[PDB]
Amino acid sequence: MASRILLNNGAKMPILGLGTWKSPPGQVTEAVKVAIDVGYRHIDCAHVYQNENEVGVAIQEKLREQVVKREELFIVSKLWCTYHEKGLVKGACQKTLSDLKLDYLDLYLIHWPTGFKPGKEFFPLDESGNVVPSDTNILDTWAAMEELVDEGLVKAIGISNFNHLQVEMILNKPGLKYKPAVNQIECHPYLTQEKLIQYCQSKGIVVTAYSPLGSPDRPWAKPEDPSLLEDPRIKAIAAKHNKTTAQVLIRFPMQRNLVVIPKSVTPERIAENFKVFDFELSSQDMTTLLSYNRNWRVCALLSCTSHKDYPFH
Numbered sequence: 001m002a003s004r005i006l007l008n009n010g011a012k013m014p015i016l017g018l019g020t021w022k023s024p025p026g027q028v029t030e031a032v033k034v035a036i037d038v039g040y041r042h043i044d045c046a047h048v049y050q051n052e053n054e055v056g057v058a059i060q061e062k063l064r065e066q067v068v069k070r071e072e073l074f075i076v077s078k079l080w081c082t083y084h085e086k087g088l089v090k091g092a093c094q095k096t097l098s099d100l101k102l103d104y105l106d107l108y109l110i111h112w113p114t115g116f117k118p119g120k121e122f123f124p125l126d127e128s129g130n131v132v133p134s135d136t137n138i139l140d141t142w143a144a145m146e147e148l149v150d151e152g153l154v155k156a157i158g159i160s161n162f163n164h165l166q167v168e169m170i171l172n173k174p175g176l177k178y179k180p181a182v183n184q185i186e187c188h189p190y191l192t193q194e195k196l197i198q199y200c201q202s203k204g205i206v207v208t209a210y211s212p213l214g215s216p217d218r219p220w221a222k223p224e225d226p227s228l229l230e231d232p233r234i235k236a237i238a239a240k241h242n243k244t245t246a247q248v249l250i251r252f253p254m255q256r257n258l259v260v261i262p263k264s265v266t267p268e269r270i271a272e273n274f275k276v277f278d279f280e281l282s283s284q285d286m287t288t289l290l291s292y293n294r295n296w297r298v299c300a301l302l303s304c305t306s307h308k309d310y311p312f313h
């Protein structure tokens with residue numbers, strides 16, 4: 001399969017990227033170096049992941065090594081919730097740029113639709129454990145994102161964890177200058193996202209699927225939770241194709257015209273997850289995988305559920 005998808009900013013985005021949430025800082029530099037060596041050209045980052053400096057060391061070394069050219073990389077990061085303020089967005093982007101050793105990002109996302117009170121804490125809480133909101137809305141945050149394009153800091157802007165009505169708000173913004181290029185959302189066989197995907201695709205927004213393996217390392221995992229990688233129905237499809245279950249789980253979103261960003265810090269798995277361009281799931285395989293939907297989310301957070309803009313129900 002073709003390795004890149006065309007965005008509505010005219011640029012092409014690699015459909016397979018390396019995720020970096022939870023990648024330890026002492027491991028992620030090697031992970032990214034290995035990823036680039038074995039063919040990855042897209043890295044998904046975020047300031048809140050607390051490892052962009054170390055990701056950046058890897059990127060810079062591979063650029064300095066001339067393993068790749070900067071134009072061939074597609075580096076994504078995300079504006080954290082405590083920086084949804086006019087006067088904070090540029091500096092947040094610039095900190096990410098400085099950490100990543102870059103002079104531009106290929107794509108910068110509003111990480112979650114919810115703004116939180118600015119300050120040192122990423123999740124400022126009241127004394128009863130509720131997140132403390134910001135008054136700033138997604139439209140004003142979007143205007144701030146548009147300025148970053150116009151200043152040359154980012155080539156594309158987009159959104160993440162926006163629900164249907166929030167995407168629509170963005171698209172219906174008075175005076176909208178740049179449409180979102182991407183909506184990055186959780187998506188896998190247990191949370192198949194057909195409705196939100198069709199809406200976004202119908203509007204020309206590319207969807208990136210996060211947690212495609214079900215985020216087995218999520219810190220709130222419980223032993224009784226469903227496990228994609230261990231689901232014998234998925235293992236059976238993998239066996240039929242002489243591929244791993246992870247490879248099926250990665251190929252699945254690719255054939256839905258999604259971008260997908262599996263995370264690993266294990267060199268062998270980083271390579272395994274890239275070897276997904278030489279096999280095809282049938283339509284029956286695809287529909288069978290879709291049938292496993294159970295509306296199950298890795299990423300949700302009780303402390304944020306009363307925020308006016310919390311996306312999920």
Ligand SMILES: NC(=O)C1=CN([C@@H]2O[C@H](COP(=O)(O)OP(=O)(O)OC[C@H]3O[C@@H](n4cnc5c(N)ncnc54)[C@H](OP(=O)(O)O)[C@@H]3O)[C@@H](O)[C@H]2O)C=CC1
Pocket residue numbers: 018019020021022044045111160161184185209210211212213214215216217229244246247261262263264265266269270272273298299
């Ligand atoms: N926008 C947002 O709000 C969010 C964005 N994301 C992004 O999406 C990325 C991917 O999602 P994430 O939640 O990290 O989880 P994934 O679904 O990518 O699962 C990662 C886990 O799977 C393991 N794994 C990777 N490859 C294999 C394999 N071939 N066989 C078996 N196990 C494997 C990893 O282990 P190991 O590393 O030990 O090899 C790790 O424990 C994130 O890292 C982040 O970049 C994720 C959540 C939210």
Ligand SMILES: O=C(O)COc1cc(F)ccc1C(=S)NCc1ccc(Br)cc1F
Pocket residue numbers: 021046048049050112113114299300301304310
């Ligand atoms: O968020 C990520 O990329 C990956 O996950 C995280 C990554 C981090 F570095 C820190 C926290 C999270 C959490 S707890 N994320 C879930 C979450 C955060 C905010 C809101 Br609004 C809702 C929500 F569900």
